[PDB]
């Protein structure tokens, strides 16, 4: 079978990018089921999963060859609501960057609906499936609890100066530092919860720079990642060429000019 290569680049940022894509992300903390459910805010810890429709086994399904050959996730078999987890990541070397959170979801999880935005990244899925995906991301090196957090609303902060204590600005202050640890005492849409979820310690600035997927001038400079620039150029150029005429002869059409690449 085909062996994926995922992404170009040779810097340690590109290596981190392939870790997120390939799902090979080290575990740095533990979050209890109850604590995670409490922060996500869709049901009371220990409560039964609400449903949006009956379990598939109970109501049956249309005669569909795709349905009969694609296995439903546990949440879909049960008829769970579609709920979500949503994260914001600082541009000051947070481990994760929005698109690569979505690639991590799309490559490594089934029946997921990821969405990428500059200041928020969302995964919608059947509730129990969404919880498992959220647990995997939040317990992993894709997450610093100071440079990233759950924010289902009022997300402002990814592009702002960090607070003096290194916490990313949150208008609703859903998280705060208590004795070196990040505590979450509101759910992801700002409602106070009757518990204190301990998300462990923030990454050191040096750890963040080692673990991050972002290029910027105080880490791996984007200007120096010529393999990534070559890839961008190649894809743009070929898109341009084949929109003109979808054939290899388009690659030397008048107007292309002396296109050239750094590493190939």
């Amino acid at each position: 079978a085909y062996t994926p290569q995922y992404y170009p680049g040779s810097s340690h940022v590109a290596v981190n990018r392939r870790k997120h894509m390939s799902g090979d992300v080290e575990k740095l903390r533990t979050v209890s089921d109850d604590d995670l459910v409490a922060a996500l805010g869709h049901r009371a810890p220990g409560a039964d999963y609400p449903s949006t429709h009956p379990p598939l086994a109970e109501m049956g399904e249309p005669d569909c060859p795709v349905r009969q050959m694609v296995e439903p996730t546990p949440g879909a078999a049960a008829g769970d609501r579609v709920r979500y987890s949503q994260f914001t990541d600082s541009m000051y070397s947070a481990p994760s960057i929005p698109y690569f959170r979505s690639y991590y979801a799309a490559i490594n999880f089934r029946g997921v609906d990821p969405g990428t935005l500059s200041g928020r990244q969302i995964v919608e899925a059947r509730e129990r499936d969404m919880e498992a995906q959220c647990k995997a991301a939040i317990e992993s090196e894709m997450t610093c609890p100071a440079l990233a957090g759950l924010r289902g609303c009022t997300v402002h902060g990814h592009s702002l100066r960090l607070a003096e204590d290194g916490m990313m600005f949150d208008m609703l202050q859903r998280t705060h530092i208590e004795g070196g640890n990040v505590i979450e005492d509101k759910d992801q849409v700002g409602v106070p919860i009757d518990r204190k979820v301990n998300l462990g310690k923030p990454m050191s600035d040096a750890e963040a720079k080692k673990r991050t997927t972002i290029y910027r001038t105080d880490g791996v400079k984007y200007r120096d990642e010529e393999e990534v620039l070559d890839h961008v150029h190649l894809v743009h150029h070929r898109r341009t060429m084949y929109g003109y005429r979808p054939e290899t002869a388009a690659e030397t059409a008048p107007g292309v000019g002396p296109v050239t690449y750094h590493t190939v």
Binding site: R17, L160, R161
Partner: protein
């Protein structure tokens, strides 16, 4: 030629916002003041108290913001109009609060250009009339009495209050210097006087030819009560009345119908055509406005064509406000809207810095304005350098990133700087468009983010549709507009496209981009809004020093 200086153009605005701040600091103390920090929010809260008391019903209240927080948990910062000393609160640039912005749009919407040659040919052919400078002069007097809504033929007519329609007028213009000089100058757009730089006047007169045209501006109050579809009709009605009087025609004979068809259709140049059913709109609305026309309405090109960047960014300011704030942020949505999606392109001298950097890079690498190769290789080089440099600016200056806090703002400004640089360097709008999408793609891989959820619909369709020639994909940028299919929905592109359409013709040192009639029409200083310095006008509106047309104080009580 231009030389990019040692200090970044955006630093002044940062220092004026943050006196004493070390601009390299990545951290800040948050005091979580809430709305009381900000005079404009405090004034709004008090306005809302009056509103609720006067009407008996709750309205504005900062405390309704969710989460038990009011706006201003961080510092609420003001905005400097680029190239201007004026710093304003952000709410002062909301189109609803800014009468200069409202009047720029009203001035476009209430304009139609109408040829006179077909009407004169009708009078000769059907009535055997002689058309002379004297008969044209009488017509121009008639049409400036009738066009605001006053009577010339019938008895016992009721009329519009002249003071409510004081902005309405009609001027003629022609490439024929001999006729233009024979008509009283109050009725004529003087092409030679307004287009005295770089021989622009001769280019415009050659492109118009010995044809005669009317620039018609119907009253602002009318398009405010009604819509842009009113403009060509209103114009035609009073044109017809004026021909009836000026040529002693029957007040309603078959030949008058020929004048109507000419004024309404055959010789009518709309600013914008209609739109399809999902976004149904009359003509002369922003969705139908082409980028070439938008760029030709802006008049900085006739003032200082030797600095193509200045005109380019004035077009950006014109288009981003119109297309994002008024059109997409109101016509096509509404509410709080899209003020800062647009202000990113015309405040704090950020786009200016990124673009002048590119201009300098291109001048030293490729040579003078308009001489760079019209090819994809060149667009790739310019866009990548301009985008990398801008990204490094955001990375090196934390408060610059904080200003353009949404990725969509950064995407539009980095891509605009890239495409404006390319347009000025190559003189080619279509090549510049390749650079626009190149910037987006470079940007996305640098930061693993670009814009909002649906920002790059057109940008991922983008590169491949630049050089398509298929029916609903292929189109030169000058003729693209806010109804080009990929562009029909999303903020952070349309005004920038207008901008670098202008940049390409400024780089080529052309007098216009797309229609010389539009160019001459909007140079006329008798318009309410000053189309030659967009950002200075916006500053006036934000400071409550812009006087719009269309108010009703003459006919309402105190």
């Amino acid at each position: 030629a231009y030389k990019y200086p040692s200090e970044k153009l955006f630093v002044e605005a940062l220092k004026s916002k943050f006196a004493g701040l070390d601009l390299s600091d990545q951290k800040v103390k948050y005091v979580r003041a809430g709305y009381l920090q900000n005079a404009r929010k405090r004034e709004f809260q008090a306005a809302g108290e009056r509103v609720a008391e006067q009407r008996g019903m709750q309205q504005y209240d900062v405390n309704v913001h969710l989460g038990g927080m009011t706006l201003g948990q961080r510092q609420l910062v003001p905005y400097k109009l680029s190239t201007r000393p004026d710093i304003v609160e952000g709410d002062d640039l909301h189109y609803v609060n800014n009468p200069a912005m409202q009047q720029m749009w009203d001035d476009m919407k209430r304009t139609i250009i109408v040829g006179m040659d077909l009407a004169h040919e009708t009078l000769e052919k059907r009535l055997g009339k002689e058309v002379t400078p004297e008969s044209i002069a009488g017509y121009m007097e008639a049409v400036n009495h009738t066009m605001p809504g006053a009577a010339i033929v019938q008895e016992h007519m009721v009329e519009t209050h002249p003071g409510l329609v004081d902005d309405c007028y009609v001027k003629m213009f022609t490439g024929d210097d001999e006729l233009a000089d024979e008509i009283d100058s109050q009725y004529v757009i003087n092409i030679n006087d307004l287009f005295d730089k770089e021989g622009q006047n001769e280019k415009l007169k050659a492109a118009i030819g010995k044809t005669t045209w009317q620039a018609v501006h119907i009253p602002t109050i009318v398009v405010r009560c009604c819509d842009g579809g009113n403009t060509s009709r209103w114009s035609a009605m009073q044109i017809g009345m004026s021909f009836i009087a000026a040529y002693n025609m029957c007040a309603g004979e078959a030949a008058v119908a020929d004048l109507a068809f000419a004024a309404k259709h055959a010789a009518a140049v709309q600013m914008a055509e209609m739109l399809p059913a999902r976004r149904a709109r009359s003509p002369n609305e922003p969705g139908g406005l082409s980028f070439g026309y938008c760029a030709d309405m802006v008049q900085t090109l006739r003032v200082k064509p030797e600095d193509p960047v200045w005109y380019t960014l004035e077009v950006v300011a014109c288009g981003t406000m119109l297309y994002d704030q008024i059109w997409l942020g109101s016509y096509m949505s509404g509410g709080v809207g899209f003020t800062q999606y647009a202000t990113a392109a015309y405040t704090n001298d950020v786009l200016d810095d990124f673009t002048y950097y590119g201009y300098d890079y291109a001048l030293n690498k490729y040579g003078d304005d308009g001489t760079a190769p019209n090819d994809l290789a060149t667009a790739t080089d310019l866009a990548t350098e301009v985008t990398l440099n801008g990204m490094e600016c955001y990375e090196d200056y934390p408060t610059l990133l904080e200003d353009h806090f949404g990725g969509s703002q950064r995407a539009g400004i980095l891509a605009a700087a890239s495409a404006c640089t390319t347009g000025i360097a190559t003189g080619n709008s279509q090549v510049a468009l390749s650079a626009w999408y190149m910037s987006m793609y470079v940007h996305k891989e640098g930061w693993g983010r670009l814009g909002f959820f649906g920002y790059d619909l057109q940008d991922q369709c983008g590169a491949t549709n630049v050089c398509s020639y298929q029916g609903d994909e292929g189109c030169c940028l000058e003729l693209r507009g806010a109804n080009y299919p990929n562009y029909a929905m999303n903020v952070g592109h349309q005004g920038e496209y207008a901008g670098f359409t202008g940049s390409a013709h400024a780089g080529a040192h052309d007098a216009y981009c797309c229609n010389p009639l539009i160019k001459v029409c909007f140079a006329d200083p008798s318009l309410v809004f000053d189309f030659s310095y967009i950002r200075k006008e916006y500053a006036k509106g934000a400071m409550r020093t812009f006087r719009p047309a269309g108010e009703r104080s003459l006919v309402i009580p105190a």
